[PDB]
Write a protein that binds this ligand. Structure first.
Ligand SMILES: O=P(O)(O)O[C@@H]1[C@@H](O)[C@H](O)[C@@H](CO)O[C@@H]1O
Length: 478
């Protein structure tokens, strides 16, 4: 009654440490190894899978005490995979200055600080009670605990190994336990029948990298894989013609983009970045490669932001006249610019790049594709243009404009974006004020600066498609 599942995936994460595994490919694995304190109810308030009401998980209950503090009462007798009982000490360590948000924690969780709330040190009240605290007020704590930043780690084991080594031999509380990790190849996990929640329904899960999507489709058809990920609308007709198979597709709260290494002289200033942005004909790409199923957002602005979503914001601009003028102004040499892509790790990455290369040729810029294999990513000094994505992981516009593009983020710190001082001051501002017209307007000003500066260029939200045998009723791919 419990099958061993074989899952053909687009990629494999670089680690299984849950924060450092945040990517398009990590969470589907780490969400089976680890649990959170609370979980989102994806079908609350009539939502078709993107609901936000919070429900108990490792925490049986919780109470917001004040604008800075939330007490969690933990489930008792929850076992980590190595037999150690989870306690409030583990939860406190998970959100500690040492592990997550303090100064030295950046050396090993590079993005921990940028993706953290303004935490203060947790307080352990007793074995099963912990208080999560923030130095300044925020309403986001509880929902943050249901996010991909909330996965609970075992303090003693993790601290002994350290972040990096723990990521190669992870121990969690989740329904599946670690068996093996081969970089750029596979992860195997097995049923944890000591799980505190519903008994696992699969005996084992193997996530196998299959880089080419047509090979993933063919492996589903042959029975080599039970489930495959990261397909496109074009694959659906063929798969659905097999009575034993099916596809599922939906718009995801994630956007595809391209971005720049702004430490490189050719992109240190906005003119050539903005020229490349203004020449992207998004409706043509969507009609050609996505069967008109991918969604083009009106800026860095998504409905899940709730009170900081602007439903009346203007479209992102397409203006080849202005693009040509900026190519001339920038002083651009005609020298080819590389665009690195890890094959089709992002669905339609290579065919979308080929369409954009032609769009860029029409404005006088020569862009060359550099298609590489997993593990073959270039050193930052050899990177110029590259593709990326951002998952919109909070019900607030703080993520990902501030997380990724704010003064504490990687776009400014690692990739060298010298953002206007006004942008960094508005990032600081929205983070210290509550939902209101000043906050809503500040996000619209950040969005405008983002478009004028072009540190990245938003393409669209992909229509994500997965496929599986109909007789495989549980699919651990999100
Ligand atoms: O495109 P990727 O697979 O690398 O994954 C990105 C992360 O890098 C990013 O940290 C996060 C939040 O913005 O969204 C995605 O998961």
């Amino acid at each position: 009654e419990r099958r061993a599942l074989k899952i053909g995936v687009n990629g494999i994460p670089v680690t299984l440490e849950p924060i450092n595994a945040i990517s398009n490919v990590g969470p589907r694995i780490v969400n089976q190894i680890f649990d959170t304190l609370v979980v989102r109810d994806f079908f609350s308030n009539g939502a078709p899978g993107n609901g936000i009401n919070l429900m108990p998980s490792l925490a049986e209950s919780w109470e917001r005490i004040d604008d800075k503090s939330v007490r969690f009462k933990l489930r008792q007798k929850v076992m980590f995979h190595d037999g150690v009982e989870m306690t409030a000490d583990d939860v406190a360590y998970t959100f500690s200055s040492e592990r997550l948000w303090g100064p030295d924690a950046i050396k090993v969780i590079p993005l921990g600080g940028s993706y953290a709330l303004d935490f203060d040190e947790p307080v352990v009240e007793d074995k099963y009670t912990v208080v999560i605290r923030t130095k300044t007020p925020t309403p986001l704590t509880e929902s943050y605990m249901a996010s991909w930043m909330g996965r609970i780690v075992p303090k003693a084991y993790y601290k002994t190994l350290g972040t990096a080594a723990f990521g190669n031999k992870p121990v969690g509380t989740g329904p599946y336990k670690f068996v093996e990790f081969v970089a750029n190849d596979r992860v195997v996990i097995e049923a944890n029948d000591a799980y505190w929640g519903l008994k696992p329904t699969a005996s084992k899960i193997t996530y196998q990298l299959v880089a080419e999507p047509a090979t993933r489709v063919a492996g589903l058809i042959s029975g080599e894989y039970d489930i495959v990920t990261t397909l496109t609308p074009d694959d659906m007709a063929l798969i659905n013609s097999y009575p034993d198979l099916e596809t599922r597709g939906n718009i995801v709260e994630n956007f595809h983009m391209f971005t720049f290494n702004m430490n490189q002289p050719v992109f240190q200033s906005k003119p050539l970045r903005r020229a490349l942005a203004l020449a992207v004909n998004r409706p043509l790409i969507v009609q050609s490669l996505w069967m008109n199923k991918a969604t083009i957002p009106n800026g860095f602005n998504f409905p899940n932001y709730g009170k900081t979503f602007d439903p009346n914001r203007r479209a992102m601009e397409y203006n080849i006249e202005e693009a040509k003028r900026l190519v001339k102004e920038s002083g651009y040499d005609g020298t080819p610019i590389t665009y690195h892509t890890m094959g089709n790790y992002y669905a339609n990455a290579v065919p979308a790049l080929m369409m954009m290369i032609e769009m860029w040729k029409q404005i006088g810029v020569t862009v060359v594709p550099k298609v590489y294999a997993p593990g073959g990513a270039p050193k930052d000094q050899d990177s110029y243009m590259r593709n990326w994505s951002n998952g919109q992981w909070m019900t607030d516009a703080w993520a990902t404009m501030i997380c990724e593009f704010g003064p504490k983020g990687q776009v400014q710190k690692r990739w060298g974006w010298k953002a206007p001082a006004e942008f960094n001051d508005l990032c600081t501002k929205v983070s210290q004020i509550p939902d209101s017209k000043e906050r809503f307007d500040a996000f619209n000003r950040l969005r405008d600066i983002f478009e004028e500066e072009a540190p990245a260029v938003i393409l669209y939200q992909p229509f994500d498609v997965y496929a599986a045998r109909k007789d495989v009723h549980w699919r651990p791919i999100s």
